[PDB]
Amino acid sequence: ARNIVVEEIVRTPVEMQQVELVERKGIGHPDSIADGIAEAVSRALCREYIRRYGVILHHNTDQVEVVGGRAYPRFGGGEVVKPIYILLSGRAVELVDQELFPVHEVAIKAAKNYLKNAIRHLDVENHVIIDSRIGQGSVDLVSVFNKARENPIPLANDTSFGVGYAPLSETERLVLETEKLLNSEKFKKEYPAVGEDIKVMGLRRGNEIDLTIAAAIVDSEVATPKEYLEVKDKIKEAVEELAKEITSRKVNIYVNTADDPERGIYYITVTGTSAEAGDDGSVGRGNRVNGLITPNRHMSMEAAAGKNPVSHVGKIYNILAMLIAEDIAKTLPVEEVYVRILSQIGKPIDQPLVASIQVIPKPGHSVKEFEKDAYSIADEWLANITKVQKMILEDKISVF
Amino acid sequence: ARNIVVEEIVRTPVEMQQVELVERKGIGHPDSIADGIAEAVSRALCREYIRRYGVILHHNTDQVEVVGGRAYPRFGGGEVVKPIYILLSGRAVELVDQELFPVHEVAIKAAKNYLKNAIRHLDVENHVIIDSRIGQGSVDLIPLANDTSFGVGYAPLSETERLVLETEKLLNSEKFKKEYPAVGEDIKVMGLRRGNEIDLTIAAAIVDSEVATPKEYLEVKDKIKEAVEELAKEITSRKVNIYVNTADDPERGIYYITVTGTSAEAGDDGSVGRGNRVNGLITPNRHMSMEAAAGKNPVSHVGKIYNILAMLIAEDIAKTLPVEEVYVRILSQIGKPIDQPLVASIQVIPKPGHSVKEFEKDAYSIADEWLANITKVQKMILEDKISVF
Ligand SMILES: [Cl-]
Ligand SMILES: [Cl-]
Ligand SMILES: [Cl-]
Ligand SMILES: [Mn+2]
Ligand SMILES: [Mn+2]
């Protein structure tokens, strides 16, 4: 019934390709800040719609602009001189049966709460201005409930595709886990000088990987250039240990490569994010839903962060494509699998115009031998598509 | 000696894959409006820096937020009820040796001029609010790489890529607009190929002042369909199915009519880097860069230059040599001039019956000459001769 297509492709697996480039924008990167606020706003709206009406009402808050401020970092502690300005945009239902729903209150509080929990040394009350221009919508709940009855699985409202793949390469895992380690609670507690604005790039040529880390250091935690350099060495040491667990390839680690001590240049910040110094961010400019930027792979340009987890395929299909890919890679004799899913307007989101599965089989196997099981994995996930709504709101799946 | 590497790759060509997906967001789509404004602002800043100082000063205007308005379309002509709001962001040099450069004036003027020329039925003075929060820079009056920057491009386009690209270009061309003024600029095209059959879905905003009745609206949709059917026959002999404004439901009174020709009027939002790559397409069957070219300084941003150069190198190779596919990737080497990349990888599938040895030397030479003329590409960008979305 469902438009699922399984095909074999021939390609050099990424692990065997000569040049592989992978990047991850960490939590404090301005683009990832935009994504994180967008998603925090969406989840807060979902939960408050549920609390008041028992159902999620339509909204999309996948539009956030982070306008950088100005700052004077100094060893021992600088100051922010001009605040970061953040504009929340999108659309949400505001009039519910002639009654007013507190869209802007929920959104601004969610954005502020996200920043406080994400960027430890950022003074949100004084370093940030948050304004909201979220568009106004209206609905009658009887209609909402009737729409839910007519179509238990929501209808697609856009023509969009999501893209995912599996399994991850060593270089992909290295980049992902380097950022996760350095922004982990345990590491932050041990090394409070390491801010959250961390960008990780892995470039593999053959069996040698250059792993470059741009990590904003918090100037209130380093009194001297010497203490700053000791922090960079502690970053390098921790990532060296991590790399030995992920790959037996040679890994060269570089931290804050624009540093130039003789010219007095160090990557120190007041708050731990370069957004303080004038760098800007917006939604969908960084990691895909698997958490990575991967030009050796395939992606959708849809920004998952902030999109309605109930009906917007731009989020749902990018998550589902990754989950189907991971399932196939985990259970079948596959070297690589790429999943692309395209919505059809007016049809339920479990009836995509196509769900395309492209597989490189392991040597000694053919896709024909397992094509029906691959179909079945995609079919069961599409038939259970609404559970993605549940995993988002239970904070079980990240979208950047 | 530039580190250019030409190698053969063995992989299923896109045209032989069973399923291919291609999308293009047309000029009036909110995301493409953001991209277009971003690039229009950058080029206006470049020209005015040159006019005043003889050099381009540092800037990045790759941050634009299009916040949709409200509108009540009506057959015969509706009205915009709440204006579109556009925030310009990024950074530009504003203090030039203690004197003030009119960043915000240049930027707002450039944004308004772009909209005026791009969206025919948009009343910019009354339908749009443009504000600027571009960050303030300062300065006192072949570049080296400061980072590892990346560009990726490919050629030639597949039949489905060509159909999607040329469908939007046709419907938003002046010649077509003159004959069918009811067709707005907010056109989104999705192409799905399965085997030798292509499904083409077109969402095209129709201008409500140009259609007096539902009957005229349906006639306009049929003229879109007929025109694209003709175009498809020029590109492919695969079966092509064309669908226009598929969410329409006449019995329930739903038609894709707009006052201005862009869904930004009705509350849809856009921002930079959410849509087309520099070749004009969104192509999940290919390899794409995540960087937003629009608004980036074309003189100093290596990622923008390399993504354009990679496309130009690929297109040249595909046009002149016996290649079925070519993928071009360029990586800068930190601390070296940008015309001396860390690697320029040229990956080719030869046409059947051919081997790369026949033409590997010519492919190297094509890549070499483009890298040697990186300054020529920068000029082409400012002369509006190369599109970036
Ligand atoms: Cl290959
Ligand atoms: Cl098929
Ligand atoms: Cl990229
Ligand atoms: Mn960015
Ligand atoms: Mn969009």
3-state secondary structure of B238: coil
**Resolution of the model in angstroms:** 1.8
The tokens for B342 are 């860390």
d(CA A386, CA A59) in angstroms, rounded, equals 17
Rounded to 5 degrees, what angle do the CA atoms A319, A320, A324 make? 125
Phi, psi (5° rounding) for residue A153? -95, 125
The tokens for A57 are 């009402």
Cβ distance B65 to A89 less than 8 Å, yes or no, reads yes
Provide the 8-state DSSP code for B351: P
Integer angstrom CA distances of residue B40 from A65, A67, B35, B106, B117 = 19, 20, 9, 10, 11
d(CA B62, CA B294) in angstroms, rounded, equals 6
Residue whose token pair is 């602009």: A65
Asked if residue A253 lies in contact with residue A236, where contact means CB atoms within 8 angstroms, the answer is yes
User: For chain A, first and last CA: distance in Å?
Assistant: 32
Please check whether residue B307 touches A, CB under 8 A: no
Distance (Å) from the alpha carbon of A189 to chain B's nearest alpha carbon: 30
3-state secondary structure of B187: strand
For residue A18, report the distance from its CA to the centre of ligand 1, in Å.
10
Search chain B and give the residue with CA nearest A25: B290
d(CA A139, CA A326) in angstroms, rounded, equals 38
d(CA A182, CA A29) in angstroms, rounded, equals 13
Distance (Å) from the alpha carbon of A67 to chain B's nearest alpha carbon: 7
Amino acid making up residue A110? A
The tokens for B62 are 């790759």
Search chain B and give the residue with CA nearest A6: B18
Q: Which residues surround ligand 2, an ion (CB under 5 A)?
A: A 5; B 194
Bridge partners (DSSP) of residue B80 are: B71
Which ligand lies nearest the alpha carbon of A286?
4
d(CA A136, CA A57) in angstroms, rounded, equals 12
* Spatial CB neighbours of A316, under 8 Å, sequence gap ≥ 6: A162, A309, A349, A385, A388
The b/e string for A4-19 (b: 16+ C-beta within 10 A; e otherwise) is bbbbbbebeebbebeb
CA B382 from centre of chain: 15
Cβ distance B292 to A285 less than 8 Å, yes or no, reads yes
d(CA B156, CA B176) in angstroms, rounded, equals 26
Task: Please tell me the total number of residues recorded for chain A in this structure.
Answer: 400
Cβ distance B135 to A283 less than 8 Å, yes or no, reads no
d(CA B384, CA A43) in angstroms, rounded, equals 42
Bridge partners (DSSP) of residue A138 are: A95
* Spatial CB neighbours of B225, under 8 Å, sequence gap ≥ 6: B242, B244
The b/e string for A279-292 (b: 16+ C-beta within 10 A; e otherwise) is bbbbbbbbbbbbbb
DSSP for B117-177, written as a single string: HH-TT--HHHHEEEEE-PEEEEE---PBPSS--EEEEEES--HHHHHHHHHHHHHTSHHHH
Phi, psi (5° rounding) for residue A45? -65, -45
The tokens for A338 are 């790429």
3-state secondary structure of A153: coil
Provide the 8-state DSSP code for A192: T
d(CA B166, CA B170) in angstroms, rounded, equals 6
Asked if residue B322 lies in contact with residue B351, where contact means CB atoms within 8 angstroms, the answer is yes
Distance (Å) from the alpha carbon of B89 to chain A's nearest alpha carbon: 7
Q: Dihedral of the CA atoms B26, B31, B34, B38 (nearest 10)?
A: -80
Amino acid making up residue A121? H
**Three-state SS across B48-99?**
HHHHHHCCCCCEEEEEEEEECCEEECCCCCCEEEECEEEEEEEEEEEEECCE
The tokens for A201 are 């790039």
DSSP for A50-100, written as a single string: HHHHSSPPPEEEEEEEEE--EEE--TT--EEEE-EEEEEEEEEEEEETTEE
